[PDB]
Design a protein around this nucleic acid. Sequence first.
DNA 1: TTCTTGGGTCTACCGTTTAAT
DNA 2: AATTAAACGGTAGACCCAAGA
Length: 96
Amino acid sequence: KFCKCGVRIQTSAYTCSKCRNRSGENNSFFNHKHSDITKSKISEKMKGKKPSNIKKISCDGVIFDCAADAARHFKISSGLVTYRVKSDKWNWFYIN
DNA sequence: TTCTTGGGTCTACCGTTTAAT
DNA sequence: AATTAAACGGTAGACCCAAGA
Ligand SMILES: [Zn+2]
């Protein structure tokens, strides 16, 4: 048996692994809902994890791994951190 | 039967914007 | 002006599940 792409496949298969459609409505989990139990398992494993989009920052010399840590140290909102970084009245800048 | 794939369904936390003070 | 909350928009990684191998 041959896949539409040209490679051989078992007669029990509809396509080769690479050509299988899994996007949108063709996904095996499309339109399914996760149970409250699954959501909790995901919740516990994620608690305390910082994401990859964090920005190291220097607050005029005092550095932080992310803007949120700086917000928590100064006790201000994250929005204000961004505001000071853009302000000509502060020397707060992201590293890189 | 098991092991592998890989993208839809989620969570926790980020950072930037903007309405409202 | 300088502030905050909430609206938006993003990442990786855990989960699920059917079908390829
Ligand atoms: Zn193919």
